[PDB]
Amino acid sequence: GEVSYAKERVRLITASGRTHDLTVELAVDPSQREQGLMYRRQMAPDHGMLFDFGETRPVMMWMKNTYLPLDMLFIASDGTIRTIHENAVPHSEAIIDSREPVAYVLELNAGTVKRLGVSPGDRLEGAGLP
């Protein structure tokens, strides 16, 4: 049938203590993680996709077939945001490497990191996290 994703409420917590909720689709399967947000033409400002690699290891992301400009947050197993790549470029096959082992990647609309005042070292929290 139609591809489905588990959804969940997560929150970004910043160093200032500010909290902001998001609704994310969980990309768990290999096909879900590879398809990512390909072909989607819209996505609400507080919605994103949380890629759950099921292990801690470096990861590689790209923008192949992706129309929405995105911010990418590379996240440790304890929810710490290690690095952030803002304004990934639609359609680009340039690899964006995590540069170090991580457990998750959060993709949000481009500009979301700025809108929410998020920085590396801030945290994502939710059901499995930390």
Q: Which residues bind Cl ion (CB under 5 A)?
A: 16, 18, 40-42, 117
Q: Does 117 bind a copy of itself (CB under 8 A)?
A: no
Q: Does 46 bind a copy of itself (CB under 8 A)?
A: yes
Give CA torsion, residues 79, 11, 84, 111, to 10 deg: 180
Q: Does 40 bind a copy of itself (CB under 8 A)?
A: no
Contact 67/36 with Cβ under 8 angstroms?
no
Instruction: Give Cα 18 to chain centroid, integer Å.
Output: 19
Contact 44/21 with Cβ under 8 angstroms?
no
Q: Does 11 bind a copy of itself (CB under 8 A)?
A: yes
d(CA 55, CA 77): 8
Point out which span in 13-21, 28-36, 68-76, 78-86 binds a copy of itself (CB under 8 A): 13-21
Query: Given the rule CB under 8 A, which residues bind a copy of itself?
Result: 7-9, 11, 18-19, 21, 23, 44, 46-47
